[PDB]
Design a protein around this ligand. Structure first.
Ligand SMILES: N#Cc1ccccc1-c1cc(-c2ccccn2)cn(-c2ccccc2)c1=O
Lengths: 35, 86, 44
């Protein structure tokens, strides 16, 4: 019963869904700067 | 106990990984909209998260939702293991 | 009115660090409470 560790091998699954939202934000930022 | 014990249920590599997403979102609000813009960005940071700027806070809100949930879940797992325990 | 709603560049970093500080306490209060519900301790 020692670890009880918190393997970030899958915490990367949260980071991979966020950067996609930042890239999706840069596509809408260009259609708003032109329209 | 200790201050090195103030970095446990999130990995030694996750506490230094959450900070990359904090500065990564405050720089997108710089591009979808400097001393007052950074004041607005974490004015928008602790309040969870334009159409380009709305999807910034909508996706950032789900990202920080899992970490604070993966922190409270892993912290309780130790306290249960440090519970019985004999 | 800014405390109930969690937490000006100088005033922004105040409500941000306070938001992380209160985030850990409410996460440690819920985690420590959830561990007793599992293993009901008996005090002699
Ligand atoms: N170590 C330790 C410790 C001792 C007394 C009370 C709590 C802890 C503890 C604190 C933390 C922690 C870490 C960062 C921020 C806040 N708290 C973590 N852990 C812990 C949890 C899971 C596995 C190993 C240690 C802990 O066991």
């Amino acid at each position: 019963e020692k670890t009880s560790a918190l393997s970030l091998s899958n915490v990367a699954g949260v980071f991979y869904i966020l950067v996609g939202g930042l890239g999706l934000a840069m596509l809408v930022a260009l259609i708003e700067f032109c329209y | 106990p200790g201050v090195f014990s103030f970095l446990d249920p999130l990995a030694y590599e996750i506490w230094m990984c959450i900070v990359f997403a904090y500065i990564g979102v405050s720089v997108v609000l710089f591009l979808v909209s400097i001393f007052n813009s950074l004041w607005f960005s974490l004015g928008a940071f602790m309040q969870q998260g334009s159409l380009s700027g709305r999807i910034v806070g909508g996706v950032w809100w789900f990202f920080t939702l899992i970490i604070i949930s993966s922190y409270t879940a892993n912290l309780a797992a130790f306290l249960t293991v440090e519970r019985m325990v004999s």
